[PDB]
Amino acid sequence: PSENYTWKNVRIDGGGFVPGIIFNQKEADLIYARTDIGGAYRWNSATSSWIPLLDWVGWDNWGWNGVMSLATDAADPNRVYAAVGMYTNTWDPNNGAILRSTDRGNTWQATPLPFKVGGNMPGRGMGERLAIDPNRNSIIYYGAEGGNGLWRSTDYGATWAKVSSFTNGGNYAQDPNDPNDYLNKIQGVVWVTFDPASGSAGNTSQVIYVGVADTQNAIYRSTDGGTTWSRLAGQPTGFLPHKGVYDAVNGVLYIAYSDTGGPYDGAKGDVWKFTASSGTWTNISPIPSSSSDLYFGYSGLTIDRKNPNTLMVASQIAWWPDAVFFRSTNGGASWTRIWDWTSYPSRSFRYTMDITEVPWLNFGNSNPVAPEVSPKLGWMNESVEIDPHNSNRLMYGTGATIYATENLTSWDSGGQILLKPMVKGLEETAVLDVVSPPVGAPVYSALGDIGGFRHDDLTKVPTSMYTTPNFSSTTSIDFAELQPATMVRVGNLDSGGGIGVTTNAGGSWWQGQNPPGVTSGGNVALAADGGAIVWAPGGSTNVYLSTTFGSTWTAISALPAGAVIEADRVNPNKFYALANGTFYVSTNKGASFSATVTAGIPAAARKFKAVYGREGDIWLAGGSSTTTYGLWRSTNSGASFTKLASVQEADNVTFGKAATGATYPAIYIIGKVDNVRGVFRSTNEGASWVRINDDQRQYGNFGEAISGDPRIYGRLYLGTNGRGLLYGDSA
Ligand SMILES: OC[C@H]1O[C@@H](O[C@H]2[C@@H](OC[C@H]3O[C@@H](O[C@H]4[C@H](O)[C@@H](O)[C@H](O[C@H]5[C@H](O)[C@@H](O)[C@H](O)O[C@@H]5CO)O[C@@H]4CO[C@H]4OC[C@@H](O)[C@H](O)[C@H]4O[C@@H]4O[C@H](CO)[C@H](O)[C@H](O)[C@H]4O)[C@H](O)[C@@H](O)[C@@H]3O[C@@H]3O[C@H](CO[C@H]4OC[C@@H](O)[C@H](O)[C@H]4O)[C@@H](O)[C@H](O)[C@H]3O)OC[C@@H](O)[C@@H]2O)[C@H](O)[C@@H](O)[C@H]1O
Ligand SMILES: OC[C@H]1O[C@@H](O[C@H]2[C@@H](OC[C@H]3O[C@@H](O[C@H]4[C@H](O)[C@@H](O)[C@H](O)O[C@@H]4CO)[C@H](O)[C@@H](O)[C@@H]3O[C@@H]3O[C@H](CO[C@H]4OC[C@@H](O)[C@H](O)[C@H]4O)[C@@H](O[C@@H]4O[C@H](CO)[C@@H](O)[C@H](O)[C@H]4O)[C@H](O)[C@H]3O)OC[C@@H](O)[C@@H]2O)[C@H](O)[C@@H](O)[C@H]1O
Ligand SMILES: [Br-]
Ligand SMILES: [K+]
Ligand SMILES: [K+]
């Protein structure tokens, strides 16, 4: 059966890249955001929070959490569309899709495309690829990747076909020779922009502009409602157009260019203005690419719709000391910048920043050496948007957050703007590991990109990610079952990898020494009494034991590198490892391991966990649909495992507080039971299961990290890859 649960995010606020923010041009406070791996959101002004729209994307169609583009209809603000799909290489096995809605994303229908959409590919900060005809709103265009060219729907997104008169599908890729097959894809047709004055209400807009990722042919135009297309005469060459923003008030098309597709790079570019009546092109770059002072391209182009001589553009990309934003109030004839050098390394600023609501955005150092400041203005700032209903509001995306101001026009009177994060409810992290100890804080997260946190209160943003050491990503975390204030975490930082240890539950950490060959965190296990650490780091040729709480290491000879390691939760002498269809057991506190199981368990399986309070009770989950699949359990310290016949497939497993009157902890799996995919609880040792999620709450490629709560019956900590860390409670 099912059981009513309540699902919420553990509060973090942001944590990842927001490639696109979209304001509806007609309705005030109608705002959407798109992400690369965690779906799309609609702003809710009444609760000052974002609402996720795609949590119904599930196991089979997981790449639809990749949102390459989004369009909100100025002629009918009920209508919204999204172009979805995550990878255009082999990593996403499915094609993309155009999703359509008539209730602002509350429900959708899908129309699958015959090609892939690259929501988390290079170039994803260019856009918007999807555009609706502002005069005749049944017409929608989509600029596609991969040489698919320009595509069109004339029935409100229900059916889509190639525009065969648009013959340039693009030839740029970030690195054509990438042997990893990630940087080598054609980024394609990158945005579509209408001239609203070229049609009238109910009639096809005759003038449409299209940007293509081709340095020699970046801009096309149709003047006949999309029947035929021309490269635009007199345009510049050598750069890729990140943004094309049309102003019908002055009859000009503004384009921001960079020498790469983004979102991580860009060394040169220009901003141009094309005047439509005359066909004239003018370089209005704040700093032109011909200047050797220029060390970035341009993106974050936006026009102030209420005052359309005002526009802004930003660096794509300036890493050092920070992003630069430029503002003009005279159509690009001249510009001012959001900061200026005074005497190196000092700067003056036209802004201040308040991150009290999201204090970890200092990245654990509020005072880096000048010229740097913390928090930074931003990076990967492709989306910069002025509210078309309020000249004083602007919002931009970074690699970590969205920042917003409500006094933007202070800039023009010589004041400073105030910027703050605006990411409540926009939960975008990838959860790599998670623990719930039986005393102290309810949960600790191990996250990509922003480290992870001790969560003292699940409704309050934590003050700081882990420090000393401060990992960029924490890949594994463990606590000593019988002394939970003793913890260890491994992860990635600057060069390679490292280990942090604590004996006061993280009030204080310190950094341990590394065994040879460490390039990333890998995974780690802590003995139940805290007296041994076994670490399988990334890069290293072995797994290692420390008997000195991280200060020294010895190679473990029988274990393959990268084996999954877990400690028994009762007996400090017992450790276990899983690698490629072999289970291994140590009874001498990690000094040596021997293979105990070599057959009968899927080679793909790579998740298992020992049960607190149950010495030698181990549950193991994994497999694949083309091999074998399921949940297995050992009650004899890994000497053997039995497959649970009640489960068809499983991918992770954990334990939590027993039901009242039950004799065994509750068991939680990511899996498939009785032909339903979802999240499942058993309160009878796996004899039967109850689904605790539902079809609106599937979260795509979730479940890499899960934990039950030994103190709270029914509670599951549910990690996702792009939707942060959830907690579910029975209702
Ligand atoms: O308050 C801010 C706080 O941030 C702390 O760092 C955080 C943070 O990092 C953001 C971002 O940092 C990137 O690194 C920057 C570096 O900080 C810059 O100083 C450097 O400047 C150079 C530039 O490289 C040159 O090309 C240019 O000419 O000069 C400048 C100034 O001298 O840029 C790097 C990024 O450089 C690379 O990307 C662009 C390429 O043009 C360039 O060649 C490439 O550099 C190479 O990169 C490799 C390894 O990748 C290697 O170091 C080479 O030696 C080097 O030459 C990080 O790179 C980036 O990952 C961070 O952004 C997050 O990225 C997440 C995805 O990660 C992966 O994919 C990209 C890859 O680079 C990663 O290795 C890989 O894991 C993404 O999901 C997330 O949304 C992004 O925000 O925020 C995240 C956190 O983890 C960091 O710890 C910082 O410590 C602190 O001091 C303070 O600044
Ligand atoms: O040559 C590759 C290159 O990758 C570079 O990093 C770039 C790259 O990372 C991919 C990862 O992106 C993470 O999302 C981040 C996002 O891009 C940022 O913008 C955001 O701010 O932060 C996000 C979080 O950090 C994302 O979380 C990762 O999941 C993703 O990694 C890839 O995942 C895919 C898909 O697999 C996963 O989903 C499906 C599940 O079934 C699977 O279990 C999941 O792990 C992986 O593809 C799978 O690969 C396996 C084996 O190879 C196949 O069996 C399987 O069929 C296939 O689905 C993929 O392997 C993994 O890479 O792209 C985004 C860009 O932003 C990054 O800069 C590195 O820097 C390079 O060093 C190099 O690795
Ligand atoms: Br730079
Ligand atoms: K567009
Ligand atoms: K640069």
From TrEMBL:
Known EC number: 3.2.1.-
Gene Ontology molecular function, alphabetical: cellulose binding; hydrolase activity, hydrolyzing O-glycosyl compounds
TM ranges: none
Keywords: Carbohydrate metabolism, Cellulose degradation, Disulfide bond, Glycosidase, Hydrolase, Polysaccharide degradation, Signal
Biological process (GO), any one: xyloglucan metabolic process
Keyword Signal: yes
Enzyme class: hydrolase
Organism superkingdom: Bacteria
Family recorded in the similarity comment: Belongs to the glycosyl hydrolase 74 family.
Protein's recorded name: Endo-1,4-beta-glucanase/xyloglucanase, putative, gly74A
Annotated gene: gly74A
Covered range of the whole protein: 35 to 765 of 1017
